[PDB]
Design an enzyme around this catalytic site. Structure first.
Site, PDB file in Angstrom:
ATOM      1  N   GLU A  98      11.170   2.143   4.171  1.00  0.00           N
ATOM      2  CA  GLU A  98      10.359   2.780   5.200  1.00  0.00           C
ATOM      3  C   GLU A  98      10.933   2.616   6.603  1.00  0.00           C
ATOM      4  O   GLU A  98      10.866   3.526   7.418  1.00  0.00           O
ATOM      5  CB  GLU A  98       8.903   2.288   5.118  1.00  0.00           C
ATOM      6  CG  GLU A  98       8.270   2.689   3.792  1.00  0.00           C
ATOM      7  CD  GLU A  98       6.926   2.037   3.510  1.00  0.00           C
ATOM      8  OE1 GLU A  98       6.444   1.254   4.352  1.00  0.00           O
ATOM      9  OE2 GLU A  98       6.370   2.295   2.423  1.00  0.00           O
ATOM     10  N   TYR A 125      -3.926  13.502  -4.563  1.00  0.00           N
ATOM     11  CA  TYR A 125      -4.190  13.422  -3.129  1.00  0.00           C
ATOM     12  C   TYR A 125      -2.951  13.624  -2.253  1.00  0.00           C
ATOM     13  O   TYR A 125      -3.055  13.590  -1.026  1.00  0.00           O
ATOM     14  CB  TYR A 125      -4.839  12.071  -2.788  1.00  0.00           C
ATOM     15  CG  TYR A 125      -4.014  10.865  -3.192  1.00  0.00           C
ATOM     16  CD1 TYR A 125      -2.897  10.481  -2.453  1.00  0.00           C
ATOM     17  CD2 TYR A 125      -4.341  10.117  -4.320  1.00  0.00           C
ATOM     18  CE1 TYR A 125      -2.137   9.393  -2.822  1.00  0.00           C
ATOM     19  CE2 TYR A 125      -3.590   9.031  -4.695  1.00  0.00           C
ATOM     20  CZ  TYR A 125      -2.488   8.667  -3.953  1.00  0.00           C
ATOM     21  OH  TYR A 125      -1.738   7.575  -4.330  1.00  0.00           O
ATOM     22  N   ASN A 139      -7.672   6.162   7.080  1.00  0.00           N
ATOM     23  CA  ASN A 139      -7.756   4.709   6.945  1.00  0.00           C
ATOM     24  C   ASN A 139      -6.912   3.964   7.982  1.00  0.00           C
ATOM     25  O   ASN A 139      -6.555   2.799   7.795  1.00  0.00           O
ATOM     26  CB  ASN A 139      -7.454   4.267   5.504  1.00  0.00           C
ATOM     27  CG  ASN A 139      -6.046   4.597   5.081  1.00  0.00           C
ATOM     28  OD1 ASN A 139      -5.126   4.576   5.897  1.00  0.00           O
ATOM     29  ND2 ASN A 139      -5.864   4.910   3.798  1.00  0.00           N
ATOM     30  N   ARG A 145      -0.304  -6.758   5.500  1.00  0.00           N
ATOM     31  CA  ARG A 145      -1.095  -6.123   4.447  1.00  0.00           C
ATOM     32  C   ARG A 145      -2.490  -6.735   4.366  1.00  0.00           C
ATOM     33  O   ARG A 145      -3.478  -6.014   4.198  1.00  0.00           O
ATOM     34  CB  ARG A 145      -0.376  -6.223   3.092  1.00  0.00           C
ATOM     35  CG  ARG A 145       0.800  -5.269   3.014  1.00  0.00           C
ATOM     36  CD  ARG A 145       0.316  -3.851   2.739  1.00  0.00           C
ATOM     37  NE  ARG A 145       0.035  -3.653   1.319  1.00  0.00           N
ATOM     38  CZ  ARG A 145      -0.438  -2.519   0.807  1.00  0.00           C
ATOM     39  NH1 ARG A 145      -0.726  -1.507   1.609  1.00  0.00           N
ATOM     40  NH2 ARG A 145      -0.638  -2.393  -0.500  1.00  0.00           N
ATOM     41  N   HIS A 159      -0.942   2.361   8.129  1.00  0.00           N
ATOM     42  CA  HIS A 159      -0.049   2.084   7.027  1.00  0.00           C
ATOM     43  C   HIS A 159       0.690   0.765   7.269  1.00  0.00           C
ATOM     44  O   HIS A 159       1.068   0.464   8.408  1.00  0.00           O
ATOM     45  CB  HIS A 159       1.026   3.166   6.911  1.00  0.00           C
ATOM     46  CG  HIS A 159       2.077   2.809   5.922  1.00  0.00           C
ATOM     47  ND1 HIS A 159       1.945   3.082   4.574  1.00  0.00           N
ATOM     48  CD2 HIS A 159       3.239   2.120   6.053  1.00  0.00           C
ATOM     49  CE1 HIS A 159       2.988   2.593   3.928  1.00  0.00           C
ATOM     50  NE2 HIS A 159       3.789   2.007   4.798  1.00  0.00           N
ATOM     51  N   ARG A 191      -9.182  -2.165   8.249  1.00  0.00           N
ATOM     52  CA  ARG A 191      -9.926  -1.153   7.531  1.00  0.00           C
ATOM     53  C   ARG A 191     -11.367  -1.577   7.258  1.00  0.00           C
ATOM     54  O   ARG A 191     -12.282  -0.761   7.315  1.00  0.00           O
ATOM     55  CB  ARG A 191      -9.214  -0.783   6.229  1.00  0.00           C
ATOM     56  CG  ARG A 191      -7.964   0.053   6.477  1.00  0.00           C
ATOM     57  CD  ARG A 191      -7.133   0.059   5.240  1.00  0.00           C
ATOM     58  NE  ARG A 191      -6.015   0.997   5.325  1.00  0.00           N
ATOM     59  CZ  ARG A 191      -5.139   1.161   4.340  1.00  0.00           C
ATOM     60  NH1 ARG A 191      -5.176   0.373   3.277  1.00  0.00           N
ATOM     61  NH2 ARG A 191      -4.188   2.068   4.452  1.00  0.00           N
ATOM     62  N   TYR A 229       5.824   8.928   1.704  1.00  0.00           N
ATOM     63  CA  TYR A 229       4.915   8.800   0.570  1.00  0.00           C
ATOM     64  C   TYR A 229       5.496   9.350  -0.716  1.00  0.00           C
ATOM     65  O   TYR A 229       4.742   9.836  -1.560  1.00  0.00           O
ATOM     66  CB  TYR A 229       3.581   9.503   0.863  1.00  0.00           C
ATOM     67  CG  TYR A 229       2.727   8.764   1.874  1.00  0.00           C
ATOM     68  CD1 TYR A 229       2.439   9.318   3.113  1.00  0.00           C
ATOM     69  CD2 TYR A 229       2.203   7.513   1.577  1.00  0.00           C
ATOM     70  CE1 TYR A 229       1.649   8.636   4.036  1.00  0.00           C
ATOM     71  CE2 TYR A 229       1.414   6.825   2.495  1.00  0.00           C
ATOM     72  CZ  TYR A 229       1.132   7.393   3.708  1.00  0.00           C
ATOM     73  OH  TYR A 229       0.351   6.690   4.607  1.00  0.00           O
ATOM     74  N   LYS A 269      -2.102   5.714  12.347  1.00  0.00           N
ATOM     75  CA  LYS A 269      -2.314   7.052  11.795  1.00  0.00           C
ATOM     76  C   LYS A 269      -3.101   7.961  12.745  1.00  0.00           C
ATOM     77  O   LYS A 269      -3.675   7.496  13.730  1.00  0.00           O
ATOM     78  CB  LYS A 269      -3.006   6.926  10.434  1.00  0.00           C
ATOM     79  CG  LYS A 269      -2.169   6.187   9.392  1.00  0.00           C
ATOM     80  CD  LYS A 269      -2.847   6.213   8.038  1.00  0.00           C
ATOM     81  CE  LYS A 269      -1.910   5.694   6.969  1.00  0.00           C
ATOM     82  NZ  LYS A 269      -2.589   5.731   5.623  1.00  0.00           N
TER      83      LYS A 269
HETATM   84  C1  LIG Z   1      -5.408   5.950  -3.529  1.00  0.00           C
HETATM   85  C2  LIG Z   1      -5.516   7.065  -2.523  1.00  0.00           C
HETATM   86  C3  LIG Z   1      -4.649   7.132  -1.435  1.00  0.00           C
HETATM   87  N1  LIG Z   1      -4.766   8.149  -0.556  1.00  0.00           N
HETATM   88  C4  LIG Z   1      -3.873   8.206   0.606  1.00  0.00           C
HETATM   89  C5  LIG Z   1      -4.350   7.202   1.663  1.00  0.00           C
HETATM   90  C6  LIG Z   1      -3.397   6.028   1.465  1.00  0.00           C
HETATM   91  O1  LIG Z   1      -3.221   5.292   2.689  1.00  0.00           O
HETATM   92  C7  LIG Z   1      -2.113   6.702   0.999  1.00  0.00           C
HETATM   93  C8  LIG Z   1      -1.231   5.807   0.159  1.00  0.00           C
HETATM   94  O2  LIG Z   1      -2.005   5.235  -0.889  1.00  0.00           O
HETATM   95  P1  LIG Z   1      -1.798   3.697  -1.256  1.00  0.00           P
HETATM   96  O3  LIG Z   1      -0.362   3.353  -1.115  1.00  0.00           O
HETATM   97  O4  LIG Z   1      -2.508   3.495  -2.554  1.00  0.00           O
HETATM   98  O5  LIG Z   1      -2.669   2.952  -0.103  1.00  0.00           O
HETATM   99  P2  LIG Z   1      -2.332   1.977   1.148  1.00  0.00           P
HETATM  100  O6  LIG Z   1      -2.263   2.879   2.327  1.00  0.00           O
HETATM  101  O7  LIG Z   1      -3.525   1.056   1.130  1.00  0.00           O
HETATM  102  O8  LIG Z   1      -1.031   1.273   0.844  1.00  0.00           O
HETATM  103  O9  LIG Z   1      -2.572   7.796   0.195  1.00  0.00           O
HETATM  104  C9  LIG Z   1      -5.748   9.138  -0.723  1.00  0.00           C
HETATM  105  O10 LIG Z   1      -5.818  10.051   0.096  1.00  0.00           O
HETATM  106  N2  LIG Z   1      -6.590   9.109  -1.766  1.00  0.00           N
HETATM  107  C10 LIG Z   1      -6.536   8.133  -2.669  1.00  0.00           C
HETATM  108  O11 LIG Z   1      -7.335   8.134  -3.642  1.00  0.00           O
HETATM  109 MG   LIG Z   2       1.011   1.971   0.002  1.00  0.00          MG
END
Ligand SMILES: Cc1cn([C@H]2C[C@H](O)[C@@H](COP(=O)(O)OP(=O)(O)O)O2)c(=O)[nH]c1=O
Ligand SMILES: [Mg+2]
Ligand SMILES: Cc1cn([C@H]2C[C@H](O)[C@@H](COP(=O)(O)OP(=O)(O)O)O2)c(=O)[nH]c1=O
Ligand SMILES: Cc1cn([C@H]2C[C@H](O)[C@@H](COP(=O)(O)OP(=O)(O)O)O2)c(=O)[nH]c1=O
Ligand SMILES: Cc1cn([C@H]2C[C@H](O)[C@@H](COP(=O)(O)OP(=O)(O)O)O2)c(=O)[nH]c1=O
Ligand SMILES: Cc1cn([C@H]2C[C@H](O)[C@@H](COP(=O)(O)OP(=O)(O)O)O2)c(=O)[nH]c1=O
Ligand SMILES: Cc1cn([C@H]2C[C@H](O)[C@@H](COP(=O)(O)OP(=O)(O)O)O2)c(=O)[nH]c1=O
Ligand SMILES: [Mg+2]
Ligand SMILES: [Mg+2]
Ligand SMILES: [Mg+2]
Ligand SMILES: [Mg+2]
Ligand SMILES: [Mg+2]
Lengths: 133, 133, 133, 133, 133, 133
Positions: free
Chosen positions: D127, D58, D113, D86, D116, D103, D50, D9
């Site tokens: 994806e 968000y 973070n 993961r 992905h 992370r 997404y 990212k």
């Molecule tokens: C849950 C959450 C996700 N996000 C963003 C960052 C996440 O990487 C992305 C997708 O969420 P998610 O698929 O829940 O997380 P991951 O990346 O751990 O699979 O959305 C936020 O900005 N705020 C939030 O509260």
């Molecule tokens: Mg996800």
């Protein structure tokens, strides 16, 4: 056994290289004997520190950079610490600094060059007196 | 959002792990707010820092260890910094500290455990005031 | 306080991870008591080391792997060394080995899993006697 | 056996952590199948990636972040690669991501973070088709 | 293809740099072909090893240091291993050893200098015969 | 500000040094501006890339090696990127490459030497045109 004055410069904070730099010195078996963190160094201590450069074209730009973020001032002790840490530091010019040195591996600019180290016995005493009066 | 108090303990200096520990916190993106180096912390300061342990059998032995070499005291700032740095620190007990944590990877003793971190909002306030009055 | 038997397995040599693995144990402050390098361990020694697995379907395949390249056998000493080194090692199964552990970070197979460590006081005694009679 | 889609990212580029992240996956012995560098990913591609989050509060802020700098998209192959990567990635929430994970060690924000990784067989297929049609 | 004899010296054990040193050699793609751990090397093998220095002012002090803790003797194999490992090792004098070398990065003393490496084809054969008769 | 063309060679994939190499360049503050992964580079692009060597004894062997596994082609940007990355790369001959450089630390062969970097402004433009037409 000598003491030298090192500054960790604001680019090290920006680039999250503070521990990387301190670690290279730590791994060479030099010991911290004084250390202060400055959220922003006073301009006057910076100008005193770099007084030899006060008439140089780059003086103001360099001072501006040196107050642009935090610094750490550290006194390191060890046998021939001054020359040894200067060798670890590497050449100011990124066309000259050797791979393996701090600047050779990590710096890419003549000003934003991560670390100061005293260049002589007398300048070490002078610089220690500025940062640790 | 939160400020926490970290101590780099004397064993980190003996074992040349100061930058290693600081680097783990730095890589997590926590900001240094204040930092002091102590060649030897006063015993009274240590006793006050660990005042909640004064009745424990290990109290004096732990104080002896804490004045046996240098300490660096650091205030770190970040969102939820207190609990996050506690999780990076790892459990006190070397039977339990998780690989990946500072203690889990680097410490092998219940007392010589490299790092202190405040355990709560209430204690962070107290400890910061002790080390940085 | 305890002694445990570690094997650095042939995959560590193929993948140039010998120092990486040894370094993780070294940083935890465990002491080497004995160390042997084997260009190829005798199959019988491997079969004896894994004698408790002789009825398992993977027994022969695992022995084949264990004589496919070099092994280093090491006796490490430390308080509660057996369980501590097991926790650093990580679970056999790559679906489960935790990030931060040797296998969790570096191994991706149930058999080619880089490192052996004794699982108990009883087995440590037996294994040390096998590798260092 | 499985293929998964990873994104490095924009925060990894800002913080110079691209090789650090890629290296953790590389050391685990996963194979790169495809890799693309994006100076800036098209917003629509991000929105499609997404799409399951389109109703979340968000969603837009996260899309803004994802087009704020470069991305590298990578297809990795390995046995059970999806769940393994993961687990290396670590939990989204910085209150929970475990030390030892990408992370857990390097990220300090729910949105910024670093990485992905596909969460399932079904989503990996989708994806991969988005980033490598 | 040549073989050279390396000693990991007692200061490497004291400073927990054994894997750091072995790793630098491993990363350069040299292979271990023999290795022995000595809890304490016999004085006589040390004096034989350093026989060329037997009349030197520093001989006794050096032998004393070499039996002051454990050592590892290792035979490394690779194309031009002797000269290549000598280059990695670095100058004996810490005012001369270059950053990037083992001694340049990690040693700060002319005696406590972490690593021995054979200096020629004939001395390698001689030293291998001492440690691996 | 210049751009240079780097290839990560198949030996880097075999030896799991891709991130190690990219990281050394990343740490020096050079930025990726284009990047492509090739599961196997076409022979013709390899021969074009090395056209100056087409009549050399080693040409065919070198091309054979360059198509023996994956490569990554990367365009890096920064002040004086060409000469700086060449210095990081190190001498082709492993009897010459200095510790601290990529080849000095990690390569042990004149052909299997991990990394290509453009040697001049004009060759960088030429090579960028081959890999990123
Ligand atoms: C849950 C959450 C996700 N996000 C963003 C960052 C996440 O990487 C992305 C997708 O969420 P998610 O698929 O829940 O997380 P991951 O990346 O751990 O699979 O959305 C936020 O900005 N705020 C939030 O509260
Ligand atoms: Mg996800
Ligand atoms: C020589 C030089 C220095 N500087 C700045 C960065 C230097 O760290 C600082 C002091 O110069 P100097 O004492 O020459 O460098 P060093 O830091 O290697 O001891 O001035 C410039 O900005 N431009 C220049 O051309
Ligand atoms: C529990 C315990 C602590 N101590 C010392 C080391 C601890 O760091 C210090 C404070 O204990 P504690 O607050 O329980 O641990 P932590 O440092 O994980 O917050 O007291 C001992 O010496 N022996 C013990 O059995
Ligand atoms: C359980 C299991 C083990 N093995 C091999 C690899 C193991 O390291 C070895 C011994 O098994 P075990 O003692 O269960 O594992 P550990 O090494 O974690 O103590 O047998 C297999 O090849 N397949 C398997 O399914
Ligand atoms: C030259 C020298 C060596 N020594 C010790 C440390 C050296 O590792 C050892 C052998 O010397 P030498 O063969 O010159 O060094 P090297 O280890 O670089 O091959 O003797 C001293 O203690 N003082 C000295 O002045
Ligand atoms: C000079 C030389 C090169 N080569 C191969 C490896 C080199 O990376 C490639 C190109 O040579 P060259 O352009 O001299 O090297 P560099 O990669 O340092 O720019 O040819 C050999 O196989 N043998 C040789 O003697
Ligand atoms: Mg100067
Ligand atoms: Mg506590
Ligand atoms: Mg077992
Ligand atoms: Mg010699
Ligand atoms: Mg060339």
């Amino acid at each position: 056994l000598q003491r030298t004055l090192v500054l960790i410069k604001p680019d090290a904070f920006e680039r999250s290289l503070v521990a990387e730099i301190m670690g290279r010195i730590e791994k060479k078996n030099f010991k911290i004997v004084s250390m202060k963190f400055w959220s922003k160094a006073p301009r006057n201590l910076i100008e005193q520190h770099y007084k030899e450069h006060s008439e140089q074209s780059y003086f103001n730009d360099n001072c501006d950079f040196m107050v642009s973020g935090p610094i750490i001032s550290i006194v390191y002790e060890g046998t021939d610490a001054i020359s040894k840490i200067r060798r670890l530091q590497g050449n100011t010019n990124p066309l000259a600094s050797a791979p393996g040195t701090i600047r050779g591996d990590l710096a890419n600019d003549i000003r934003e060059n991560l670390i100061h180290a005293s260049d002589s016995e007398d300048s070490a005493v002078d610089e220690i007196s500025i940062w640790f009066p």
